[PDB]
Design a binder for this molecule. Structure first.
Ligand SMILES: COC(=O)[C@H](C)NP(=O)(O)OC[C@H]1O[C@@H](n2cnc3c(N)ncnc32)[C@H](O)[C@@H]1O
Ligand SMILES: [Cl-]
Lengths: 112, 115
């Protein structure tokens, strides 16, 4: 099933894009929870981390490397938090794997 | 002493105790001593990387492996309703051990924002 993140990848609806390559896209979250809050998503439609395959390991790690490079480019020199939500208890809001990167304020503990 | 002298390096070398869930040549999963959810464990690389902001491009497969191990351990622990994965970077992340560590939290409803 297609999601709004598919529409963003296909450029059918606008988003504030930070970075793109052949396999992922980073863009500011439309409902930001911190002064900087962006998502890194794969272009491959993996619905949730629980169904990711072993062959996806490099792609998932690529999301994190892109995330940390984007965080540095956006000036998050005091730190940040990365989050992946799975399912109902995880609070996953879109069934397309997405890495949240949040910073620009003190992040608290517990993380929700 | 491979793995560094953070407490996680010592856990890797079996010098201080841990409740281990899974171990392979690349990583180790073990329960957090200060759980923030009914299930709360960490997945760490055996290679010492101090924080995500200094990970190298060639660490991509290793970082992805942490997530794959995290989701497999979550399934093995019966977290069938979901869970949240977290990596904290630096002061604003609240990082307290400077050895890259992926948290997996589940067994309760997680809230938004994630801290
Ligand atoms: C306030 O936020 C933070 O401190 C974040 C979570 N720091 P962070 O560096 O992201 O996570 C480190 C975690 O490592 C756990 N820990 C520390 N010592 C041991 C140990 N000996 N065995 C098992 N777990 C241990 C702490 O309870 C933290 O949850
Ligand atoms: Cl989500």
């Amino acid at each position: 099933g297609d999601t709004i993140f598919g529409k963003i990848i296909r450029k059918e609806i606008p988003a504030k894009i930070i970075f793109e390559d052949d396999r992922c896209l980073a863009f500011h979250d439309i409902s930001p929870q911190a002064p900087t809050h962006f998502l890194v998503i794969p272009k491959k439609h993996i619905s949730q981390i629980s169904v990711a395959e072993d062959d996806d390991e490099s792609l998932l790690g690529h999301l994190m490397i892109v995330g940390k490079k984007c965080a540095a480019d956006l000036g998050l020199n005091k730190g940040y938090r990365m989050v992946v939500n799975e399912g109902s208890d995880g609070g996953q809001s879109v069934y397309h794997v997405n890495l949240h990167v949040l910073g620009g304020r003190q992040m608290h503990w517990p993380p929700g």
